[PDB]
């Protein structure tokens, strides 16, 4: 086991400009804050697809399409005893609208 710095390298990227995407999406989603004070980040925000189908032009649910969650395996740092351990957390970031896999 090796030493880890308290400083976090931040590239300060800005592609983060998009707004209220979770509600403007045809596969809309809701967020859920998970909290752990011995985990970095302490808050891990989880998305949940609002529906199984997608929202049509008339604002109603369409069963012929699927809202599917986009998941990413991510690292969080956990405090032990004292030492640090990496931990993988599966995060649903948002949802996308897909044409279903219709096997015949």
């Amino acid at each position: 086991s090796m030493k880890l710095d308290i400083g976090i390298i931040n590239e300060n990227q800005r592609v983060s400009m998009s707004r209220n995407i979770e509600s403007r999406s045809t596969s809309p989603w809701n967020y859920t804050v998970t909290w752990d004070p011995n985990r970095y980040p302490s808050e891990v925000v989880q998305a949940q697809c609002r529906n199984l189908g997608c929202i049509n032009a008339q604002g109603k649910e369409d069963i012929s399409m699927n809202s599917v969650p986009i998941q990413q395996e991510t690292l969080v740092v956990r405090r032990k005893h004292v030492s640090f351990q990496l931990e993988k957390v599966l995060v649903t970031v948002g949802c996308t609208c897909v044409t279903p896999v219709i096997h015949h």
Binding site: G7, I8, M17, R39, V77
Partner: protein
């Protein structure tokens, strides 16, 4: 103090205390709460002031100043009595997040159990326009519950917010000039700007009426002819970037030339005998009714009464009231009580104009049949002593009608319309 901070981060103290900013975005853990081992400094309340971080006069962004208030808490035990404290500030503006460690030293003179020591201020957490930001504050060790604060950030719709922030002025500027004998779309963007441009006709139900689309590299001056102008002609501009804000403008809504051209481009079309359609670029409120055209030309007399002016909606199928079609029957269209259309929809199908007299019978009480002939000089009751074509032939037409030689165009409990050929008498 100011609504304007520099591009570098800086800490601010209330009198007496000393704050050193230690942020490089640290690995901050709230951790578990611990019993206090005597007096501890405690964050009591967060306060956020919106500020403007400017790296130059053009490049500016919304920044969030955070003031953290501190009081002496913990256990009570009776340089000496100075109190140290290291205060974390956690900022979360989804998707990003950053952590700021500050260290406060409170001189003994300010250490009064229970009471405040003052505040530490942080300039500043940069966040996007319209973003919702969450802040947390706590000491490390954590002796109490974290403080939480949620802020919703303004949109470009704010005062200061306009002129200094590029995400507000770097928008695709549009100006219109109808002075150069033609119509000009002056697009004021930077030399390097790539943007989507779309000219559309804004219809009520199912608005897409595509006319033009162009991916460009501005600034450009798109020239249109004053013949292409319609009231619902709207422009849509947006930089070619994902989720870029689209700007819409409809500058011809009450332009005189636009309304003029709107009707020039409006057409009535036949689908079948009992089905007609109004085709116009824009949808204006209008009334339509059947007209009777004479073979002498354009003087077309509408048949109100017995018929009525009914509301006509653009791109909607209109079902004719009458039982039989006639080449002399034209459809008249009025809007703002002015005549705009007169298409004789049965001229190609059943044409040309027949030399037929129109008779307007009205069943009176006791079911009395009263005949009238629609002539250029109004409706003449038959038989008559008038020096007019139909009155002269009155007695012959009345015979034609009752002998069934006339075509019935419309039937009702109150009356009927009859088309009587004159060809047997005029030649």
């Amino acid at each position: 103090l100011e609504r304007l901070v520099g591009p570098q981060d800086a800490t601010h103290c209330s009198p007496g205390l000393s704050c050193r900013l230690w942020d490089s975005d640290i690995l901050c853990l709230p951790g578990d709460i611990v019993p206090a081992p005597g007096p501890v400094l405690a964050p009591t309340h967060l306060q956020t002031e919106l500020v403007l971080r400017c790296q130059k006069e053009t490049d500016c962004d919304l920044c969030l100043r955070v003031a953290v208030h501190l009081a002496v808490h913990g256990h009570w035990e009776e340089r000496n009595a100075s109190l140290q404290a290291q205060v974390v500030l956690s900022f979360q503006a989804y998707p990003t997040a950053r952590c700021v460690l500050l260290e406060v030293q409170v001189p003994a003179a300010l250490v009064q159990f229970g009471q405040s020591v003052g505040s530490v201020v942080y300039d500043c957490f940069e966040a996007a326009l319209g973003s919702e930001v969450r802040i947390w504050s706590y000491t490390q060790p954590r002796y109490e519950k974290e403080l939480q604060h949620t802020q919703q950030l303004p949109d470009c719709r704010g005062l200061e917010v306009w002129n200094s922030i590029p995400s507000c002025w770097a928008l695709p500027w549009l100006n219109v000039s109808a002075d150069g004998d033609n119509v000009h779309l002056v697009l004021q963007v930077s030399e390097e700007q790539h943007f989507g441009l779309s000219l559309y006709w804004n219809q009520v139900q199912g608005p897409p009426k595509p006319r033009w689309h162009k991916q460009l590299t501005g600034p450009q001056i798109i020239t249109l002819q004053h013949t292409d102008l319609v009231p619902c002609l709207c422009i849509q501009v947006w930089p070619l970037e994902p989720d870029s804000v689209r700007t819409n403008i409809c500058p011809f809504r009450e332009d005189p030339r636009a309304h003029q051209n709107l009707w020039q481009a409006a057409r009535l079309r036949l689908l079948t005998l009992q089905s007609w359609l109004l085709d116009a670029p824009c949808s204006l409120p209008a009334e339509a009714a059947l007209c009777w055209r004479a073979p002498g030309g354009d003087p077309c007399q509408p048949l109100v009464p017995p018929l009525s002016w009914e509301q006509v909606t653009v791109d909607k199928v209109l079902e004719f009231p009458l039982l039989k079609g006639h080449p002399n029957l034209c459809v008249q269209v009025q809007s703002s009580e002015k005549l705009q259309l007169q298409e004789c929809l049965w001229a190609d199908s059943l044409g040309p104009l027949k030399d037929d007299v129109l008779l307007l019978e009205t069943r009176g009480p006791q079911d009395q049949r009263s005949l009238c002939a629609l002539e250029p000089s109004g409706c003449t009751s038959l038989p008559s002593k008038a020096s007019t074509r139909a009155a002269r032939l009155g007695e012959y037409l009345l015979q034609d009608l009752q002998s069934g030689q006339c075509l019935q165009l419309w039937d009702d409990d109150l009356g009927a319309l009859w088309a009587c050929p004159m060809d047997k008498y005029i030649h």
